[PDB]
Amino acid sequence: PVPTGVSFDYIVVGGGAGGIPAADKLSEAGKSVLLIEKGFASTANTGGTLGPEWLEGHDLTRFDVPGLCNQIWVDSKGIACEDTDQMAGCVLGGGTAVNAGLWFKPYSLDWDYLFPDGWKYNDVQPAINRALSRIPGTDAPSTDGKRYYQEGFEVLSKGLAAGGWTSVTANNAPDKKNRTFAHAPFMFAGGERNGPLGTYFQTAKKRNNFDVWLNTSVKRVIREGGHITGVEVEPFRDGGYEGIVPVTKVTGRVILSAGTFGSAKILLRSGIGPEDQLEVVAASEKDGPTMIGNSSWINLPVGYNLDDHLNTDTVISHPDVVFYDFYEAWDDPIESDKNSYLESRTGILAQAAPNIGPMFWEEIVGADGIVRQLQWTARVEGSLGAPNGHTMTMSQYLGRGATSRGRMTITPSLTTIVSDVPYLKDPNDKEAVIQGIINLQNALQNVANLTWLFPNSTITPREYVESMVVSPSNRRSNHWMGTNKLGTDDGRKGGSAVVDLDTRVYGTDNLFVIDASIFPGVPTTNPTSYIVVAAEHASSRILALPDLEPVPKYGQCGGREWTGSFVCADGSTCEYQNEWYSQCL
Ligand SMILES: Cc1cc2nc3c(=O)[nH]c(=O)nc-3n(C[C@H](O)[C@H](O)[C@H](O)COP(=O)(O)OP(=O)(O)OC[C@H]3O[C@@H](n4cnc5c(N)ncnc54)[C@H](O)[C@@H]3O)c2cc1C
Ligand SMILES: *[C@@H]1O[C@H](CO)[C@@H](O[C@@H]2O[C@H](CO)[C@@H](O)[C@H](O)[C@H]2NC(C)=O)[C@H](O)[C@H]1NC(C)=O
Ligand SMILES: *[C@@H]1O[C@H](CO)[C@@H](O[C@@H]2O[C@H](CO)[C@@H](O)[C@H](O)[C@H]2NC(C)=O)[C@H](O)[C@H]1NC(C)=O
Ligand SMILES: *[C@@H]1O[C@H](CO)[C@@H](O)[C@H](O)[C@H]1NC(C)=O
């Protein structure tokens, strides 16, 4: 049901980590902004009604309560995305609606190392200060200020300190990421999930110039040559819109926030991507008939540069470790905790599941003289089939500096798949992983009664690693990034960049990408704060661009190398001549 009479200055596709802050910042500037979201209302502050029965009538949903964080693992359906082969949030708030909520003041090195000039640390520091003003951490999300079931934590944190590692409050010392441990920071506020759903979205829905369309999927963008006139929508659930939504004439811009796999899909379907992938959509049953003609295709490396943290699990067990079963907190919650979540917002349930114990980091100089960044996350839970009771799992992330990369491609079904596994292609990446375990072991060699299950004392760290299967299934961190890479090297000429420094899509005048897909690689940390920061930074850059000026007739409106305006002044049209030229006539 698309209304025959309306248009927007900005259309933002997808309501995730990138999209919600983008839509907020653009509407704050008084532009007409429409947020189009696949999924439904999630958290209570967005009008989400969904959740377990012990939550009735107290104005909370399954997405408000950090202790219910891990339900997505046993019950995801109608929530997780069905058009990808990996795990992603398809409700409002995207990933930030379903994840553990870990939230980090970024590490200045990450921006200096991963991004070209204009995105380095001195460039994005204002966006960092904005994002973290709206969402300061807490490493003690329970509103009374003290942390619960910390016995596991204290075992490890005293273990590490003894091993020569330094305690920090992570977000007070964002830049100290070598040989460091901290209480885990979260985006929570008032003991409720909070995040961008809690902050950016709330200021935006107070605005007249802001609109949200839920239960609505964007199929592709509607473009004449290099200029995007609108987006085409089919309902994902009844009550969603069918149609084609226009953007303000000439001026209008579209922002793709649909995610690392989401935005990539929309691009391919819009005739933007690699020749082979574009060819798959052309032969597709769903879009084949109505897809844009191949003369208007743009070749860019959409789907390449697929990146993720390489995850390696490890397990220990110790006597004073205390397990808590968060899965059992969905159905039959321990009643004092339920009582003491529902009234002052405290107790174990105001912490994310499972209990997420010490965060610790170190940086390893490799034989190639590349610095590789590690992050460990400890939790109280078994992992590798080790039992749940006294165990703690310590998961090692291989982050910034790792050189390997995979690929995302599309099926005839128009669902996305990871067809090149990104992990451990460079052996020096493996070397850092192994050395990190060795290092972890000697800091914990002095702890009384600590038992090493994974690896057990009968296997060497090296053997332990080489035996493992390298696949998303066992090794994914769910931190997928990079399919639409930001960079100065235009993809149409063979470069690696899908979008430019303004996040503008090469080959287009008005189309932009803000989400995890633009990152040249993964950062030190869980990315959500990074993606929010990037939303802050990109929206201000985009808002500093002057209004698009149309092309006078007889002028150039397009071509394979064209960087300029693709739209024609009133009284002439843009028509193709050859792949290097298009004129107004
Ligand atoms: C379960 C899990 C655990 C994780 N743990 C953490 C954590 O504790 N901390 C951390 O920093 N991050 C965590 N992450 C990483 C994180 O969730 C993502 O990195 C981040 O949310 C990605 O932001 P995004 O904007 O690129 O994607 P998304 O948040 O996934 O945004 C996608 C949004 O667009 C919508 N959408 C998709 N396609 C369309 C379409 N065609 N039309 C309209 N709308 C569409 C989706 O419904 C969704 O709302 C984890 C995520 C997973 C899933
Ligand atoms: C989007 O779809 C959802 C799910 O079907 C709709 O949410 C339901 O709304 C009814 C009444 O409006 C409630 O009784 C249900 O509890 C809701 N279900 C869920 C899962 O939230 C929602 O109304 C739809 N939104 C639009 C704009 O059409
Ligand atoms: C992180 O800190 C550790 C120790 O603080 C550094 O370890 C040193 O590594 C070099 C070789 O890379 C050795 O020659 C030194 O003797 C080590 N010192 C200690 C105390 O172990 C490590 O190099 C640091 N990493 C970075 C990237 O700064
Ligand atoms: C482009 O489209 C034309 C007509 O639809 C077709 O004949 C031609 O083979 C196509 N070329 C490619 C490379 O897809």
Residue numbers in the entry: 223 to 807
Show me the paper's own sentences about this structure.
An oxidative system was recently discovered in which extracellular flavocytochromes, that is, cellobiose dehydrogenases (CDHs), cooperate with copper-dependent lytic polysaccharide monooxygenases (LPMOs)8910111213 to catalyse redox-mediated glycosidic bond cleavage in crystalline cellulose, hemicelluloses and starch. CDHs are large flavocytochromes containing a haem b-binding cytochrome domain (CYT) connected by a long, flexible linker to a flavin adenine dinucleotide (FAD)-binding dehydrogenase domain (DH). The DH domain oxidizes cellobiose at the C1 position to cellobiono-1,5-lactone with reduction of FAD. The ensuing step involves inter-domain electron transfer (IET) from the reduced FAD to CYT haem b, presumably by single electron-transfer (ET) events, followed by ET from CYT to external electron acceptors such as LPMOs.
The active site of CDH has two glucosyl-binding subsites for cellobiose binding, subsite B (for binding site) and C (for catalytic site). Superimposition of the structures of MtCDH and MtDH-CBLM with ligand-free MtDH revealed that only two active-site side chains differ in conformation: the indole ring of Trp295 tilts slightly ‘upwards' with a maximum ring displacement of 1.4 Å, and Arg601 undergoes a conformational change involving 180° rotations of χ3 and χ4 on ligand binding at site B.
